[PDB]
Structures are given as structure tokens and as C-alpha cells.
Design a protein around this ligand. Structure first.
Ligand SMILES: *P(=O)(O)OC[C@H]1O[C@@H](n2cnc3c(N)ncnc32)[C@H](O)[C@@H]1O
Lengths: 76, 976, 294
């Protein structure tokens, strides 16, 4: 399986995962490809925020699914 | 040119080319309801050449729900004519006029962009066909209750110059292979960050000099650290060096006309949990016109079952595709209403699309956007009798939410922290919502004053309001828009020092808090306060086109501090000191030099001059501090004191020589330029650039600029009258004699001697004054000095210089901001506030929001539930706490936990203090045990307990009966 | 008991403790009774703190109360404010067979309100009033250059990690990578010049400078005017090791007296040897005046 991760700035990342990986594994693969620590990553999919300790099967993330890597901002 | 003093923050988002293009564009806006008013406000604040407000409808009571520029005295007048006078005051650089005639073909030819609101189907089709045939950008926007629709048609050939709004990223090259698929490897394994399929250009390449300044080349990312650029065998062998910089390639796209786009719609997704919503909303919005034609131009009645069934039948007849019938009925039941936050958000989106059409920057909506906020409605719905109009300005809102929700809104009390752009927008939305108009109240606080640069994105302030408090001015401004609003304004900064006003009693009668701050410390403090007082908090933040909204619900969601944001990026000491390689390092170095030279070197001297007993106070300081202060005072007052402007010029020249010749020569002496390590790579390679000392030339504009700025600032420090004549300074600086430089390889007695020297030689008649760095003033020469210093240091290391714009952006820590993003994120925040006020508790209803108006992108997520932990089998979250009442001694406090909770406290703390610990000294432990906890807190924190403090918060680290550490909730200690 | 055994048994109890660095003052203010470098930052921070900082500092204190390195070669002593864990002072004794051997180096540590997200701030106080650069990574203004203290891009296994990094790790990193036997090669680029006669002479010159610098500031000034927090520890350490210190300094002087190949290094080595003898005479004068601890 292969999934895509879109950053809030619009950069696209391609990951090679399996339907049974855990969110920690996904965050670690993201850390290789980008460099953000896993605790600073916010993954959104289908209106849900992915939390550690679960697998992609619970969120029903299948092939060619798109995740969103969002972050908070400090202006106002 | 563009007036930077007004468009300073907006320039960092848009750019000079975009602002120039918008300054030549004429905009026509049809329909001046709430949505049209928001679009006009945001566009005018954007700074287009001119805007024409056209409308045929007359103002009514239903328009007051969202139109903040209309009053009851304006009923019966044309909306555009009534609002034109007030809209023109937002920006004097924009020519605002009103039109009431028909939209003829000849009239439409004068406008670059045409925005259509509240237009019927036939007029929409005709104007869309004419605009597409004649190359006029067209935008159609509508709002029906809690639903939205946006359509964009920018022509048959639209060119985008910057697709995504991100700055280009440059990387340093370590090695490039010489073959048919040459691979570029980054420096010391640093991620380049290049996207696949990007276009890059090369510079400063040695050996492969042909790649220098070449046309952009398509790349193939082979990994996080390497990428391929194609065949490199035709060039020379790569020696060293080289920087690859990303190039933004323009893109040209084609927009379908409205007639064709309706049959083949392409949807921009607004919520990824409602993927089937846009397909149904398209048909519903299309069939609304047919229903109006079939019912004498009347929308379905609010929450009427018969009209909903008729609309569903019309939808079924008009289309053959399957649709969500429940969604159609829900749309029909509330399509006749109108609310403020939705109008604000859609207006902020449509205005950004107008700016995209004008300037050609960012990617447009392609082509339809459909949004809804159905979660704001009650789960059981609204009874028909409850939604009937009552002859009030909130009639269009009662048509959506009912009269009971209006009564709930009138009695609500909400606190808004910060009165900036987000704060002003939140205040406007709360005022138009009717929040606090009954027995409730709206509290707003802000410690800052109004500056000129704030008028670009804060529409509640006027040029004559400069130097007035933000909060009071905003409250007065929103009192005019809706006279029924009750507002209390404070000029206080939220924190530990203002808890006298924002006490526990103040937070006890609040219903929620809305955050509109610009720093993390205030956010953390407000999150802690909302946790302690158990009230919902809505957090908002923006950065350029980016924005986010987070909702915190007591006992339901995690707090703001439960997650972590990336830390602020610092610079290594060695990189800033000796080996800079980017303009950011030189700018930070220039800022530090400014601080150290013009502020830190004079604080002690100013304090000594002002305070007669300063010497006796500093004589009691421990360690070498008295010497470190006395010698600095002596240096500032006797050694380096200039007696004339000529001495200031001489000091500036010597400082220039020391900073750009002497220290560079010393660094080169320590590390020779041609030094090469054993394995082959030279020392001055890669991230390290070999510097070269400069040669002073009075004819060089940079050197004279630095001398001028430094001498004038030095004269200002010592009170000497400034000489702002470039020719005079150039003449003076040529007479300075520069000494030759060569590279190199009892304390009480000193204190008394220095004190005697200060008493005898130093004069107290001086006027030493440290300088406060101000970036927004162009006459104080602070930015001139910063730019000159940074550019000279860059010239030392052959770093490309940066103009005043980029230097002000980086050194000043300016946060880019635009009005469109602020409006969108305030609308989203007010929607969340409405959800909270309704009474929702399930996390399904609430939505954390994320946006980037450049892509365009919007997404939502459910807030994460609070983490659960167990001690002795009892579940607890960040919202739970222990309750200890009365006045107890420290020993009694420990015994209470040890006996009831079976927890042995090994560390007890109050904020940053430490009341008790296992490693504390025995004497202090014995002393503190019999004392009451209030007395212990007073002793430890070294401050008195104010009368307004009715409780204290303690954090305890405990051990169970088995001796293992366990996490436990915090303790709320109730004072007697 | 052997002198090493007595040293280990006596210095074990005083590794971690609290000191009264801040006392009550008038009008609800506080003043420092000890010289702390980060007093201005402490005042600027005020009462601001991240919620996780309390738990992190409690865990750090629990770790420090038992895991502080201690050996006859080098040891680490930590003092914290009696009421504030975020204000600390660290004393590190130079490891054996290094130019810093048996020298007491004092650091000032302040934990920012954002800890553990941001790395803590550490500044060297034993700089001889900014006239001595003890190491390429120890600038004479007191700043300490470590990769573990950097949140900048770097490399994930080298940056400051909010989960894995800790105060003990930073202390051990300083103790084992800054006070190295040959500090000259700590500078990047110079590392590969080792093994050549020119590199050996440069390292000898650097060590000759560091010898007198340490003898003056890390020993003599610490004996004459010890910090109030580490007075007892410094006195015990210098009394228990006076003979070893004298023998080591005599060996240093003998080593500096050997003939040199190049005149440029020879002149500097002779000057540093003269200064070293001048400071060693004073140190011998001071050591004899040390009354034995109880
Ligand atoms: P943007 O910077 O336009 O808006 C932010 C506004 O919030 C105010 N502000 C920042 N920090 C605080 C605190 N701690 N208390 C009250 N108000 C605050 C700024 O002054 C801006 O007006």
C-alpha cells in the first residue's frame, strides 16, 4: 500500500505503509522524510485526528488515501 | 510606490508585484447584504484601485442581522448608497462609489473582476456568459442560513505566478556525480526539502561553472538527501561549492464558463467528513431559484414542513441524480435565515479569490466551493413557532436558531483576550450575534495602543484613533454598529500581575473565553485559567494565509498545553559569531550589536546618573558584579564619552574598522584561508565561507550609510544634537586617524578607586539615555543601522545582501498578516462559540479548523478527548482535582493525603515554587511543618497573599503504598 | 582507608543539595544573595511556566539525587535554590590526565519556562573575568557550545530532544567531550591535523596556556574566594588532593621545561612556564593555609 501526506503549506509526501502499521510507525516514516518529531505532528483524515496507539485499519486508511499534516499558529 | 507604512504586514503576504497589479484593478460588487458588505470591507482593506458598490434591494429589518453599517434609520434606503459613505473611510487610497442603475453590457466592461451576490438565475447566467465572452473575471457567492456557495470563473487563460505562496528553499551542494543521471548530494546529510518534480537553478558552482545561472531544470527526488538533475556529462568535473535554489514556475489554467461548469462541476472539499455534501448542495442551490419562481419570489418559510416537502419535490423534479433527502430538507428549513459568522467567513474567502483574480497570485478555487455549519443547530431541531419573526433586528437569526437561542445569547457572558485583528473581528461578530445584549456582557482586554500599521487589517480603527487604547476604541466602535451591545473594556495585560481584576470571581461568572493573542505565554496562561475555572476556551491563530482554530471543552477535550508546537529556531553560537552563511545570521548579529552598543552599554550609566545612592546599592552586590557594573559605568561615562559630534563620527569609524577589518583579520589569522584538512576538504568549505576584510571607501554608499547611522545614534545616546547631513558626515569621517592593528595569538581597593574616579571626574550633568529598538519609525535610523550592519557583514562573507524590506521582516520578527485570513478564522471561531453556547458536549459536533487561503485549503477534525490515567483504579483527566478545604498546617496537609488518598507526597510545589520535597534541608523542613499552608506559600514565594485570592493550586508528586511513583491530579486548596 | 576511598566516601553525601540563593526583600520583591548569570532572565520570565515543566523538573531532581557521576578523577556537584528547581549551579572537577585536572569549574544553569521543549541555558562562570578561553567550545564570555543544546535543524540524533535529552546527559557530555585530554583538536578542521609535528606543537602550546589558566582560576581563585554554594565541597576537595595537585603541577612544569623544536612555540611555552611557576608558588602558599575539615 502507498499513501500520500499533504502539509498545510501544500508539499506532498509519499509513504509506503501496510494496512496494519501503527500511527507511531507512520509518524516515524514521516520523521525520516521531513524531520519533525513525532510529538509535533498532527495527522488529519476524514475529520478525525490520528492518535498514537492505533493502526491504519481502525481509521480505514486504504491505498491512495490522503492524510493532512496540520499545525498551530501563534499570530493574532 | 506602495505605501509600506500602511501595507507593511500585507506586503510580506502579497508582494510588490501583486500589490502593483491590484492597484490597477477595478472591482464591481453586486449585492450589499452581510456577505457583500464583508467582501467589500476585505477588498477595500486589501487596497484595490477602486470598487463600485451596486445594489437594487432596499434596507430592511432582516438586513440588520449581519449588515453592521446599516441602522434602523436606514430602512427604506438603498443598501449600497447607505453603506458607501462608511465603507469609504476604511481606506482613503481606494475610490469607492455607488451605482443603482442596471448592469448593462457597456457598464460591465469597466471592471476587471465582477462579484455577484443575491442575483437571480437569469441575471447570473447572462452576466456570466458576457463576462466569459469578454475576458472579465466572475465570482458568484451566496449564503443561505448555515450554507455557502462560491463559484470562480477567471477566464479562458489565467496565469498564476506563485501557486502556493511559500518562499523558495536553497540548499548547499556537497557532490554532483558526472554521468548520464547525475545525482546532487546535499551537505553533511541535511534535507533539501525539494518536492518531486521541482525546478531548481544553480549558483556559485566550481568546476561545473556551466550550471551557474542556468535555466531551471526539472529534478527527480531520489531520497531525503539526494536528487537527480539529468545528464551532467557534458559539463566539467565538479570541484566544490554550489547552491541549488528552488524556482517558482508559473502555471496557466483554463476556467469553464458557468453554463458548462454547472453540468460538470469540480468541487473544492471544505470538510473531508462530508464528501457527499457538495453534490447535494449544488442541486439544492440550483433548485432554490426554481422554488422562488414557483412561489412568487418567496423562500421557504423557516422550519416549515410543507415548504420543505415542496422544495424536496422541486429538487427531485429538477435533477435525476440521487441526493441526500435529509440534507435537502435541512437546507430548505433554514435557507431563509442569515447569520453573521458564516457571512464573515465566506466574505473573507471571496475577497481572497478577488485578490487572486486581480494579482494572479495563489491558486484559485477550481471551481465550486460548498460549505455548511449544520452542527451549530440543536440536535432536536427548532420548533416552527419558535422560529417566527418577532419584529427584531435578529429576525434572520431567529429564522435559523429560534427565539430561545436568542434569549440564551442575550444572557451569555464571554471574555475576549486581545483586541487585534482577530479580536476586532470577534467583537464585531459577537455584537452582531446579539451576545450579551440582555443580562450578559462582553469583556475585552488589551494593553497595546493603536499604530498606523494596524489600520490595514483592523477595520474598527481610524487614522484619527492612533495612540488610543485598542480595547476601548474597539468597544466604542462596536457600540455604534449595534446599540444594544453591553461591553466592558480593560487596558490590562493578562497574566499573574493582573489577577486583582481577573480574579477567580471574575472567571466564575464567565461562560467562555476567546483567544486573540499573538504569543504563546498568554495562550498558556489563559489555558491554565480556563482549566482551573472549568470554562470553554476557543483558541485562534493566524500566519499570513495560514490559520487554525482549536476548541477546548471542560471534561471533554484535551487542553491547549496537551500538545506541543515546534520550538523557535535558534542559531548556533559559532555560526552567529565566526561562520555565518545566510543573511539571517548577519541580521541577528546586527540586532545583537545594536542592543549591546546602544542599550546595554548605557543602562548602568543612566541608572548611576539618575540615582544618587546607586553606588552604595551596587557595593553590596555579591561576587564580581560590583566591579562588572562600576567598570562599565566608568567606560560609558569617562573613557568613551564623546564631547562633540566629531568624536561620535570618530567612534563610528573606529567601530566600523574593528567590526569589519580587525576581527576578520584576527579570524583569518586563526584559520588561514587556504587551510585544508588531512582527508582533502578545505577548512573554509561547505557551510563555512572564507571572509575578506573590507576597505573603507567614503564614496561607497553602504560605508557612508553605516557611518551616518552609527554616528547619529551615538550622538542621540549622549544627547548631542544630531547632524543629519550626509555631506558633512562624509567630510568629517575622512579626517579620522585609524590606528594600526596586528593579529595576536584587592577587589575592594579597585571598587573604592572606581567609586572615587566616578565621584571626581565623572559629571552628573550628562544625559545618557539607552535606546529602545523601534522598527516602525523611519526617522529614528534604527532600521538604517540594522540594514547597514547586516549588509556589511554579508559583504565580509560574500553573502548576498538583503534590502530594507527583508531586513525589517527578519530582524523585526514581523508576523505577516492579511484581513481575509482574519475574517475566515474569526467566522470559524464564532461558529464554534455558537456550538458551545447551544449546549453541545459530544466531540462529533465540535470541529478544530485548519486553513491555507493560498491553496486554497480548509480542513476540520474532532478535538481529541482528554487523556485518561488511573491511580488505585480511579480514572482522572486534566480536568479533575483534589478538594482540600479549610486552613491546615503542612504536616496536616501531608497527613490528609497519606490517610485518605493513601499517597505519600514526596514533592509539593505551587507554580514555580517548591514548598516541600524529599531532599530539602532538615532544618527548613522542621521549620515549615507546623506553619499553615498560606504562611508557607507566603514564605516560599517571597510575596504577600492578596485578599482576592480565595484558593491555591498545588502540584504533588506522590508514591503509592508500594513505593512507586504515581501521577495524580492537582490539588485545589480552599482558603478559609 | 586509602585517600581515594576517603574522597569517594566524603564527597558522596554532598553531590546534590539546596542553597539559599534567593531571599525575601522589601515591597514583595526578591534579591539574589549569590552571583547568578541568569538573574536577568529569571526576572524576565517572572512566574511563567509550562505545565509539564513541574513534572519534568521533579523527575530531573529525582534522577540527580542519585545518578550524578562521582569518581576520584572527576565529579559533578549540583546545587539548586531551596524554593526553585529551575535555578541551579554546577561544579565540575577536571578529569585526570587533562589540562583541567583537579580544577573546579563552576556553571550557572537556568531552566526556561518552556522546558523541556527548549534546551536549558548553561553559562560558564570560571572564565577569569572573561580573560581566559578554556576550550574551543568554552568561549571567554561564558557561552558553552554543544550540539545537544541546539534545537536548530542539525540531525535528529544530535539535536535537543524533548523526550530523550536530560540534564544528566548534558553534564556528562560537558565532562567527557569538553574537558578532553587534548582540547586543541576540539575545533573542527584541526582534528585531522593531529599526528603531524606542527599539530603536536600547536596542541602543546594550547595545553601550556591552559595549564596556567587552570592553575590560576580553577584552583587559586576557588581556594581564595570560593562560591558560597560550593565552599565546603571546594575546601574538602582541595584539602584531600593537595599532594596530588602539587605533584601534577610539578610534572606540568617539568614537561614545559623540555626543549622545543620551533622558536615560535618555544617563546610562548617559556612565557607560559614562567607564569605557571609564578602561580604555582602562590598556590603552594595557599594550600598550606587550608585548615583540615572536621
Ligand atoms: P495581533 O498582534 O494583531 O493581535 C494580538 C493582540 O493581542 C494583544 N496581546 C498580546 N498579548 C497580550 C496579553 N498577555 N494580554 C492582553 N493582550 C495581549 C496585543 O497587544 C495585540 O493587540
Amino acid at each position: 500500500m502507498q499513501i500520500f501526506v499533504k502539509t498545510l503549506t501544500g508539499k506532498t509526501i509519499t509513504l509506503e505503509v501496510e494496512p496494519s502499521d501503527t500511527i507511531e510507525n507512520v509518524k516515524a516514516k514521516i520523521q525520516d522524510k521531513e524531520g519533525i518529531p513525532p510529538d509535533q505532528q498532527r495527522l488529519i483524515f476524514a475529520g478525525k485526528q490520528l492518535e498514537d496507539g492505533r493502526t491504519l485499519s481502525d481509521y480505514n486508511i486504504q491505498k491512495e488515501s490522503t492524510l493532512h499534516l496540520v499545525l498551530r499558529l501563534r499570530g493574532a | 510606490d506602495i505605501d509600506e507604512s500602511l501595507y507593511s504586514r500585507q506586503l510580506y503576504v502579497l508582494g510588490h508585484d501583486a500589490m502593483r497589479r491590484m492597484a490597477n484593478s477595478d472591482i464591481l460588487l453586486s449585492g450589499l447584504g452581510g456577505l457583500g458588505l464583508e467582501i467589500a470591507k476585505n477588498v477595500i482593506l486589501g487596497g484595490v484601485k477602486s470598487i463600485t458598490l451596486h445594489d437594487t434591494a432596499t434596507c430592511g429589518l432582516h438586513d440588520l442581522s449581519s449588515q453592521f453599517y446599516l441602522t434602523e434609520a436606514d430602512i427604506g434606503k438603498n443598501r449600497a448608497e447607505a453603506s458607501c459613505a462608511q465603507l469609504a473611510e476604511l481606506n482613503n487610497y481606494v475610490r469607492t462609489v455607488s451605482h443603482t442603475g442596471p448592469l448593462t453590457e457597456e457598464f460591465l466592461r469597466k471592471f476587471r473582476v465582477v462579484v455577484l451576490t443575491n442575483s437571480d438565475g437569469e441575471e447570473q447566467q447572462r452576466i456570466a456568459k458576457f463576462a466569459h465572452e469578454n475576458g472579465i473575471a466572475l465570482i458568484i457567492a451566496e449564503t443561505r442560513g448555515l450554507f455557502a456557495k462560491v463559484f470562480c470563473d477567471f477566464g479562458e487563460s489565467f496565469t498564476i505566478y506563485d501557486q502556493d505562496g511559500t518562499q523558495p528553499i536553497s540548499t548547499m551542494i556537497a557532490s554532483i556525480t558526472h554521468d548520464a543521471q547525475g545525482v546532487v548530494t546535499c551537505l553533511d546529510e541535511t534535507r533539501h526539502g525539494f518536492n518531486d518534480g521541482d525546478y531548481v537553478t544553480f549558483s556559485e558552482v566550481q568546476g561545473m561553472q556551466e550550471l551557474n545561472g542556468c535555466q531551471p531544470l526539472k529534478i527527480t527526488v531520489l531520497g531525503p538527501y539526494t536528487f537527480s538533475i539529468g545528464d551532467t556529462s557534458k559539463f566539467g568535473e565538479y570541484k566544490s561549492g554550489g547552491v541549488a535554489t528552488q524556482v517558482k514556475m508559473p502555471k496557466t489554467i483554463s476556467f469553464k464558463p458557468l453554463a458548462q461548469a454547472t453540468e460538470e462541476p469540480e468541487f473544492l472539499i471544505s470538510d473531508f467528513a462530508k464528501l457527499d455534501s457538495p453534490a447535494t448542495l449544488h442541486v439544492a442551490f440550483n433548485a432554490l431559484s426554481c422554488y422562488r419562481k414557483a412561489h412568487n419570489g418567496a423562500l421557504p418559510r423557516p422550519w416549515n414542513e410543507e415548504d420543505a416537502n415542496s422544495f424536496l419535490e422541486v429538487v427531485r423534479a429538477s435533477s435525476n441524480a440521487e441526493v441526500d433527502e435529509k440534507l435537502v430538507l435541512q437546507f430548505a428549513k433554514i435557507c431563509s435565515g442569515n447569520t453573521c459568522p458564516l457571512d464573515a467567513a465566506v466574505g473573507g474567502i471571496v475577497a481572497q479569490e478577488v485578490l487572486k483574480a486581480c494579482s494572479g497570485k495563489f491558486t484559485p478555487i477550481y471551481q465550486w466551493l460548498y460549505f455548511d455549519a449544520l452542527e451549530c443547530l440543536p440536535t432536536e431541531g427548532v420548533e416552527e413557532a419558535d422560529a417566527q419573526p418577532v419584529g427584531s433586528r435578529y429576525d434572520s437569526q431567529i429564522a435559523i436558531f429560534g427565539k430561545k437561542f436568542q434569549e440564551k445569547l442575550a444572557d451569555s457572558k464571554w471574555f475576549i483576550v486581545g483586541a487585534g485583528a482577530i479580536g476586532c473581528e470577534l467583537l464585531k461578530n459577537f455584537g452582531m450575534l446579539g451576545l450579551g445584549t440582555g443580562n450578559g456582557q462582553i469583556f475585552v482586554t488589551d494593553m497595546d495602543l493603536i499604530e498606523k500599521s494596524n489600520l490595514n487589517r483592523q477595520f474598527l480603527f481610524r487614522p484619527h484613533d492612533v495612540q488610543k487604547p485598542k480595547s476601548m476604541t474597539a468597544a466604542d466602535a462596536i457600540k455604534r454598529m449595534n446599540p444594544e451591545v453591553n461591553v466592558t473594556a480593560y487596558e490590562l495585560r493578562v497574566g499573574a500581575e493582573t489577577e486583582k481584576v481577573f480574579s477567580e470571581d471574575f472567571f466564575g461568572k464567565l461562560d467562555g473565553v476567546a483567544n486573540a493573542l499573538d504569543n504563546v505565554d498568554a495562550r498558556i496562561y489563559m489555558d491554565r485559567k480556563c482549566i482551573f475555572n472549568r470554562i470553554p476556551l476557543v483558541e485562534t491563530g493566524t500566519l499570513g494565509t495560514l490559520g487554525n482554530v482549536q476548541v477546548i471543552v471542560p471534561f471533554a477535550t484535551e487542553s491547549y498545553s496537551s500538545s506541543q508546537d515546534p520550538p523557535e529556531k535558534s542559531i548556533p553560537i559559532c555560526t552567529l559569531k565566526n561562520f555565518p552563511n545566510a543573511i539571517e545570521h548577519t541580521l541577528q548579529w546586527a540586532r545583537d550589536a545594536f542592543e549591546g552598543v546602544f542599550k546595554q552599554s548605557a543602562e548602568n550609566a543612566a541608572q548611576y546618573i539618575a540615582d544618587p545612592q546607586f553606588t552604595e546599592r551596587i557595593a553590596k552586590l555579591p561576587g564580581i558584579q560590583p566591579l562588572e557594573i562600576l567598570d562599565s559605568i566608568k567606560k560609558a561615562l569617562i573613557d568613551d564619552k564623546p564631547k562633540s559630534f566629531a568624536h561620535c563620527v570618530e567612534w563610528a569609524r573606529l567601530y566600523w574598522e574593528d567590526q569589519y577589518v580587525n576581527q576578520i583579520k584576527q579570524l583569518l589569522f586563526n584559520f588561514p584561508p587556504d587551510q585544508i584538512t588531512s582527508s582533502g576538504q578545505p577548512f573554509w568549505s561547505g557551510p563555512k565561507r572564507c571572509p575578506d576584510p573590507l576597505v573603507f571607501d567614503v564614496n561607497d554608499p553602504m560605508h557612508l550609510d553605516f557611518i551616518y547611522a552609527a554616528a547619529n545614534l551615538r550622538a542621540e545616546v549622549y544627547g548631542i544634537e544630531q547632524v543629519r547631513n550626509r555631506e558633512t558626515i562624509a567630510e568629517l569621517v575622512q579626517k579620522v586617524k585609524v590606528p594600526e592593528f596586528k593579529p595576536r595569538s584587592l577587589d575592594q581597593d579597585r571598587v573604592d578607586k572606581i567609586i572615587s574616579e566616578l565621584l571626581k571626574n565623572a559629571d552628573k550633568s550628562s544625559k545618557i539615555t539607552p535606546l529602545e529598538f523601534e522598527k516602525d519609525d523611519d526617522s529614528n535610523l534604527h532600521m538604517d543601522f540594522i540594514v547597514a550592519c547586516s549588509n556589511l557583514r554579508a559583504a565580509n562573507y560574500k553573502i548576498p545582501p538583503a534590502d530594507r524590506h527583508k531586513s525589517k521582516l527578519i530582524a523585526g520578527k514581523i508576523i505577516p498578516a492579511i484581513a481575509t485570513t482574519t475574517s475566515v478564522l474569526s467566522g470559524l471561531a464564532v461558529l464554534e462559540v455558537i456550538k458551545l453556547i447551544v449546549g453541545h458536549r459530544d466531540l462529533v459536533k465540535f470541529k478544530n479548523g485548519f486553513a491555507n487561503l493560498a491553496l486554497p485549503f480548509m480542513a476540520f477534525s474532532e478535538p481529541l478527548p482528554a487523556a485518561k490515567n488511573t491511580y488505585y483504579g480511579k480514572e482522572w483527566t486534566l480536568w479533575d482535582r483534589f478538594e482540600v478545604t479549610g486552613e491546615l498546617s503542612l504536616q496536616e496537609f501531608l497527613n490528609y493525603f497519606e490517610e485518605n488518598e493513601k499517597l505519600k507526597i514526596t514533592m509539593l510545589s505551587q507554580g514555580v515554587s517548591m514548598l516541600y520535597s524529599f531532599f530539602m534541608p532538615k532544618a527548613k523542613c522542621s521549620e515549615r511543618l507546623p506553619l499553615p499552608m498560606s504562611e508557607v506559600v507566603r514564605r516560599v514565594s517571597k510575596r504577600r497573599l492578596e485578599p482576592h485570592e480565595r484558593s491555591l493550586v498545588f502540584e504533588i508528586c506522590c508514591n503509592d503504598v508500594d513505593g512507586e511513583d504515581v501521577e495524580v491530579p492537582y490539588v485545589r486548596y480552599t482558603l478559609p | 582507608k586509602s585517600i581515594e576511598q576517603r574522597y569517594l566516601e566524603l564527597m558522596k553525601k554532598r553531590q546534590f543539595d539546596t542553597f539559599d540563593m534567593i531571599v525575601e526583600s522589601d515591597n514583595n520583591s526578591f534579591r539574589f544573595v549569590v552571583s547568578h548569570h541568569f538573574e536577568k532572565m529569571v526576572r524576565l520570565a517572572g512566574d511563567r511556566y509550562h505545565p509539564s515543566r513541574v513534572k519534568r523538573l521533579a523527575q530531573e531532581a529525582v534522577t540527580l539525587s542519585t545518578s550524578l557521576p562521582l569518581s576520584f578523577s572527576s565529579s559533578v556537584f549540583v546545587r539548586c535554590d531551596t524554593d526553585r528547581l529551575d535555578i541551579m549551579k554546577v561544579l565540575i572537577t577536571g578529569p585526570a590526565d587533562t589540562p583541567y585536572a583537579n580544577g573546579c569549574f563552576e556553571f550557572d544553569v537556568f531552566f526556561p519556562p518552556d522546558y523541556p521543549n527548549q534546551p536549558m541555558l548553561i553559562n560558564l562562570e570560571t572564565t577569569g573575568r572573561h580573560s581566559v578561553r578554556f576550550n574551543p567550545n568554552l568561549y571567554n564570555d561564558g557561552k558553552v557550545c554543544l550540539s545537544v543544546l541546539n534545537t536548530w535543524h542539525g540531525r535528529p540524533e544530535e539535536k535537543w530532544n524533548a523526550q530523550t535529552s536530560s540534564f544528566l546527559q548534558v553534564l556528562v557530555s560537558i565532562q567527557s567531550l569538553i574537558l578532553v585530554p587534548e582540547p586543541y583538536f576540539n575545533e573542527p578542521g584541526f582534528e585531522r591535523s593531529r599526528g603531524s609535528p606542527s599539530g603536536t606543537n600547536s596542541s602543546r602550546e594550547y595545553n601550556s596556556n591552559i595549564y596556567q589558566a587552570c592553575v590560576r582560576w580553577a584552583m587559586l581563585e576557588q581556594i581564595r574566594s570560593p562560591s558560597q554554594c560550593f565552599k565546603d565541597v571546594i575546601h574538602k576537595h582541595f584539602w584531600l588532593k593537595r599532594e596530588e595537585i602539587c605533584a601534577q603541577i610539578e610534572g606540568w612544569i617539568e614537561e614545559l621545561g623540555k626543549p622545543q623544536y620551533t622558536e615560535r612555540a618555544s617563546r610562548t611555552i617559556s612565557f607560559n612556564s614562567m607564569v605557571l611557576r609564578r602561580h604555582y608558588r602562590h598556590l603552594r602558599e595557599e594550600l598550606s593555609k587550608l585548615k583540615p575539615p572536621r
